[PDB]
Structure 1
Amino acid sequence: SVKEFLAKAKEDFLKKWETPSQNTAQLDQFDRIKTLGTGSFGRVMLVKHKESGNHYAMKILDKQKVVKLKQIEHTLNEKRILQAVNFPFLVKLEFSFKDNSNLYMVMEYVAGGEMFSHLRRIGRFSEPHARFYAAQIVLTFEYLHSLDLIYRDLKPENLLIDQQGYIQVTDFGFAKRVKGRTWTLCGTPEYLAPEIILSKGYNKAVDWWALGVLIYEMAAGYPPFFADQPIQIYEKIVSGKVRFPSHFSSDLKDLLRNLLQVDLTKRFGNLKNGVNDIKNHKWFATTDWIAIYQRKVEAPFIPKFKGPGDTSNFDDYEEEEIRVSINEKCGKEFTEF
């Protein structure tokens, strides 16, 4: 069942991986409305597709900034992987294309906003609320990992809540197709596994660490390791002593000690039983994994939505003109985009 599912999931993925989609829209097919969010470099805008009238989220990447930050390969990774995957909690890439100055990835617009904003506004999530989101990340990582994909940037800022209150994972910027180990220092400081930090080489178990960080932060309202600067955070991660809010249930604490486990022979996700050590953990005992995949569970929270194009679940951002030069920049570098 899971085996037949993942197997055919894999054949579908490989066909798209081997022959990616290219150039399925162009800039003037869309009206740009408002910025939805921004990252290290580059921004996401709410746009309206002229001919269909549908709204989308358009991620704009300046090729020159990509090159300068040395993210060419990661950007090619991002698009090649996002156009090939298919899972109920992964955001859909609807179009991609490039022009003289920029790379564009047009996704389904997920109007409920970032988990981040809700989390900070509300304070923290009760354990059943946190568990419901966590479950979706567990299933998503089972899917991804099965394709030899590592995700590498789990955090509430890259998690979107859809109109049904379910999660949509976005930002495949550091996603990578790798069998065995890899070495890139990347992710977000609060979420980095200690082996990433220690320059050891690392594998997919870093996504299970990050899940532990996510679950903690969701339930606590603050991360397990915080400080004012990254370097202080790394220190605390490397120590690995973790302390839990007084309100955490015994089950939750036990799960987190097994995810935020500095020892890879003992971290959940990374063992002989694989994801089942997580799915069968006591904290998830009330979770109907089939029902979650099927999206039949009642969400704990359903965002307010006032008609298409509403951005009220998102912060406001400074807008700025998207330039497009008359000279092609970095054409060769991004040919396969």
Structure 2
Amino acid sequence: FVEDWDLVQTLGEGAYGEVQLAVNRVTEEAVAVKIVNIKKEICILKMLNHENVIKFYGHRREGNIQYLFMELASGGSLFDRIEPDIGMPEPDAQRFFHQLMAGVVYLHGIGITHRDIKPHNLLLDERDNLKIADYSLATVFRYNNRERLLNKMCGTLPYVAPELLKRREFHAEPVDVWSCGIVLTAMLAGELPWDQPSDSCQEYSDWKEKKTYLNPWKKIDSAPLALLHKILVENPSARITIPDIKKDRWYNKPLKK
């Protein structure tokens, strides 16, 4: 198998192609390999250097198949740490949220939007450090200090911001903030609040009407729920920004040893 690397186990599939564990017969160093536009993805992957983003090691083409070598996350995904109908202990949810914001602030700072934040795309290293993975939908929204609005509809319906179903064009950053809000909801309640944030979605109307005696909102303590009230705001220019998320009372609440 490719160069010194043996492809010894599968970690995920479907998507565009498969992800393999690559143990180096020589050094025993273990990495991840994605087996697959791709030009643009590679170019974004080479920009990424942060502790909460999956590191890119290199690519080797071999006829049809490209091979993307990235940092391995041996802890699996945040999706596997969320217990259905329960979620996880509030202190673990807060730490993962801190790491997720650190990663999102980095991407936005280099003018990159991920566009598909959800628990399947948030992986853990062996010390339970969160890493944003899968840059196949990622795009430049800021270049030479000029912002460009996005127009492609993409992501996963339960995680997408409402403006992306309703507007011709929209700002990248509030879309990623919204999906972090759905991720925070899943961690604290082990359930997604709606199929999609459309006015024909009863659960979404129930939330705009502030009916928080229904699930999933009734499983969530008042402090983190006050933050979700500022994140899941339908008007993207009134929605809270990451600088202001970092001032939020629950965000700054001591919880974890």
User: Under a length normalisation based on structure 2, what TM-score does the superposition of the two structures give?
Assistant: 0.86
Name 1:276's counterpart in structure 2: 243
1:45 counterpart letter in structure 2: Q
| Residues 1:48 and 2:23 aligned together | yes
CA distance in 1, matches of 2:219, 2:31: 40
1:60 counterpart letter in structure 2: I
The unaligned stretches of length 5 or more in structure 2 are: 142-146
> Superposition pairs for residues 1-337 of structure 1, below 5 Å?
27-61=2-36, 72=37, 75-120=38-83, 123-178=86-141, 179-203=147-171, 204-226=173-195, 234=198, 235-236=200-201, 239=204, 241-242=206-207, 243=212, 244-269=216-241, 275-286=242-253
Once the two structures are TM-superposed, the CA of residue 95 in structure 1 deviates from its matched residue by: 2.0
- Percent of pairs identical after alignment? 26
2:189 counterpart letter in structure 1: A
DSSP-derived class of the 1:284 partner:
coil
Cα 1:96–1:120 shift into 2, 3 Å:
farther
Whether the 8 Å contact between 1:185 and 1:199 is mirrored in structure 2 is no
Once the two structures are TM-superposed, the CA of residue 51 in structure 1 deviates from its matched residue by: 3.4
Cα 1:44–1:133 shift into 2, 3 Å:
same
2:158 counterpart letter in structure 1: E
Whether the 8 Å contact between 1:149 and 1:176 is mirrored in structure 2 is yes
1:151 counterpart letter in structure 2: H
2:29 counterpart letter in structure 1: N
1:59 counterpart letter in structure 2: K
Once the two structures are TM-superposed, the CA of residue 122 in structure 1 deviates from its matched residue by: 9.1
2:245 counterpart letter in structure 1: I
Whether the 8 Å contact between 2:161 and 2:197 is mirrored in structure 1 is no
Once the two structures are TM-superposed, the CA of residue 50 in structure 1 deviates from its matched residue by: 3.3
Whether the 8 Å contact between 1:55 and 1:109 is mirrored in structure 2 is yes
1:144 counterpart letter in structure 2: L
Question: In the comparison of the two structures, how many residue pairs are matched?
Answer: 243
Q: Deviations over 1:168-199 (max 9, x none)?
A: 11111111112220111111121111111224
CA distance in 2, matches of 1:116, 1:196: 24
User: Under a length normalisation based on structure 1, what TM-score does the superposition of the two structures give?
Assistant: 0.67
Whether the 8 Å contact between 1:90 and 1:140 is mirrored in structure 2 is yes
2:180 counterpart letter in structure 1: L
Name 1:66's counterpart in structure 2: none
Cα 1:259–1:233 shift into 2, 3 Å:
closer
Cα 1:241–1:82 shift into 2, 3 Å:
farther
1:103 counterpart letter in structure 2: Q
Whether the 8 Å contact between 2:8 and 2:23 is mirrored in structure 1 is yes
Once the two structures are TM-superposed, the CA of residue 237 in structure 1 deviates from its matched residue by: 8.9
Q: Deviations over 1:139-192 (max 9, x none)?
A: 111111111111111111011111111111111111111222011111112111
CA distance in 2, matches of 1:48, 1:237: 49
Whether the 8 Å contact between 1:60 and 1:104 is mirrored in structure 2 is yes
DSSP-derived class of the 1:246 partner:
helix
Larger Rg over CA atoms: 1
Whether the 8 Å contact between 2:163 and 2:236 is mirrored in structure 1 is no
DSSP-derived class of the 1:28 partner:
coil
Once the two structures are TM-superposed, the CA of residue 53 in structure 1 deviates from its matched residue by: 2.2
The unaligned stretches of length 5 or more in structure 1 are: 1-25, 62-71, 227-231, 270-274, 289-296, 299-337
1:250 counterpart letter in structure 2: S
Whether the 8 Å contact between 2:114 and 2:138 is mirrored in structure 1 is yes
DSSP-derived class of the 2:66 partner:
strand
